[model samples]
Target: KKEIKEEDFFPSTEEEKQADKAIKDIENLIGESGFPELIENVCSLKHEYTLIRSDFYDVITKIQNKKISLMKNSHNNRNKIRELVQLQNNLKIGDELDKIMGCIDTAEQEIRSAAFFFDEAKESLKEGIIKRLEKSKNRAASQLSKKALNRAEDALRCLENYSSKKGEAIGRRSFIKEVVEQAKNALSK
Candidate 1:
């Protein structure tokens, strides 16, 4: 594996800075594209799910297999071979002694996968702002539809912030819904 230094994260040359600026410009353009809030997060979760399914599933499956072996195997085997066979079956029998090795391989990989999934989850949640907008407006017309969408998305975040920080704010849904309806009516003209 190639070791990555801190320099990899930053622009080392003028061309890299220009490339970074171009990427930022493209990202801004993407935000204006419809469904920007929906598509990427949804797709990224598929990646995270694939990662977690493979990594943790292997760990848990191995654990369950070992537990079942302990339960279903003959007691004579356990009594006689528990210590001696731990030498041969140390790879399968989980113990405190082997945990550091497990952490280095299985547990560490699972944690990294989970951290990636956590970041993906955060992005998916941020994209839900559009969802409440689509709900609040109920599909309105042009002009006022823009405001309806923007306000609905904002109100979505506002209520979410309140719910997260203050256990839900008073009349958030009804208030936002009422305004969105009013905006829709204005667009009907």
Candidate 2:
């Protein structure tokens, strides 16, 4: 194996710096808004999931196969010469492999930090905004519809923010439902 230097793991190059900044910027946006934060955090989690699925899943699957072997075959035969084999073919090698190892570690650290913000925002939004919106939904149905639509339009600005943070595809139905619910609530009173 080629020796990995500090330069290999750290983001030192211009391109590497840009990539690192992009990831850090995404991480920095975690606590800005409730729904938007939740969407972004989920998106981050998906990215984390994709990375683990690609890099770490093979090791886990092999270990699973080992456990299955121990369960089916006698434990005595589990560690036999036949058990000795090369790493799974799906696993990468060389520089790419080492770089991914670094990435996984960094990702784990960022997720740990992001989790607190995600949890806090989730709770606050659920308890505060959602509950209030639900109760007051029917109060001003007739009177609030126009003003509510205006506020809803203001709220619509958040969709651009959320979509930028998340993707176009995440939670579209749920978001529309929430917006329509808000409009209905506005019209009820």
TM-score leader:
1
| Clashing residue pairs for model 1 | none
Which segments of candidate 2 are over 4 A away from where they belong? 1-38, 54-56, 65-75, 78-142, 145-189
Model 1 scores a TM of: 0.25
Give, for candidate 1, the lowest lDDT window spanning 10 residues.
165-174
Worst 10 residues of 2 by lDDT: 81-90
- Top candidate on lDDT is 2
TM of each candidate vs. truth:
0.25, 0.22
Query: Cα RMSD (Å) per model?
Result: 25.8, 26.2
Candidate 2 per-residue lDDT over residues 51-110, each given as its tens digit: 444534445355447546665766566444133222222232334334433444444444
Error of 1 at 13 (Å): 46
**Model 2 TM-score, all chains together:** 0.22
